[PDB]
Amino acid sequence: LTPKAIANRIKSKGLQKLRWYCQMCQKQCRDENGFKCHCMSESHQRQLLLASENPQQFMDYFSEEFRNDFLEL
RNA sequence: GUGCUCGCUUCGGCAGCACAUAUACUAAAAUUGGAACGAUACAGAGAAGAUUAGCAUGGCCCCUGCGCAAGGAUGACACGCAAAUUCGUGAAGCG
Numbered sequence: 001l002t003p004k005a006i007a008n009r010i011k012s013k014g015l016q017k018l019r020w021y022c023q024m025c026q027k028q029c030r031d032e033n034g035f036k037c038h039c040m041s042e043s044h045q046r047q048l049l050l051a052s053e054n055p056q057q058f059m060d061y062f063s064e065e066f067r068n069d070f071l072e073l
Numbered sequence: 074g075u076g077c078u079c080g081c082u083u084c085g086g087c088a089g090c091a092c093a094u095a096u097a098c099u100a101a102a103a104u105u106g107g108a109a110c111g112a113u114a115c116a117g118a119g120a121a122g123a124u125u126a127g128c129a130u131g132g133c134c135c136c137u138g139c140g141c142a143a144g145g146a147u148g149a150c151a152c153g154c155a156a157a158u159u160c161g162u163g164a165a166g167c168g
C-alpha cells in the first residue's frame with residue numbers, strides 16, 4: 001500500500017541466515033531471539049521433549065529428507 | 074630514632090624513663106580461553122503473503138538514543154477445571 005509497507009515487503013522477502021531458524025518448529029523466527037523464543041513458547045518445550053525422547057530418529061529423518069532434496073536439485 | 078635522669082657516671086659501654094603505634098587487590102601476575110557483514114566467490118529483488126483489522130491485559134524481551142524524547146523488533150492451543158443435588162461417614166449439641 002504505502003512506500004514503507006512496500007520496502008518492508010522487500011525486506012521480508014529477503015531470506016536470511018539460519019540464526020533465527022528452528023527446525024523443531026520448522027519456524028524460522030526472526031530477529032535477535034528466534035530460537036530462544038521458540039524455547040520460551042510451550043511448543044519448543046514439547047518439541048525438544050520429543051527430541052530428547054527419541055534423539056536418533058530425528059537425526060536420520062532429517063539427514064535423509066535433506067539428502068533426497070539435494071539429489072533432486 | 075629523637076630527648077632526659079644532679080642515672081651507674083664516664084664521656085667509652087649498660088640501664089631506666091618521655092615518646093615515635095602496626096604499609097600493603099604486597100605478585101614482573103602465575104594461569105585461563107573468543108568473536109568480523111572481513112577477503113574472495115557466488116548470486117541476484119527470488120514473486121511464494123493478503124497471513125481478511127487495530128488497542129489492550131502482560132514482566133515478551135533486546136537495540137539505537139542523554140532522554141519521564143523519539144525510534145526499532147519480537148511471544149497465542151492465553152483451555153477442562155466443573156456452585157454443586159444425592160446418600161453415606163464422622164464430630165458437636167439437645168432430649
Ligand SMILES: [Zn+2]
Nearest residue numbers: 022025038044
Ligand atoms: Zn523452535
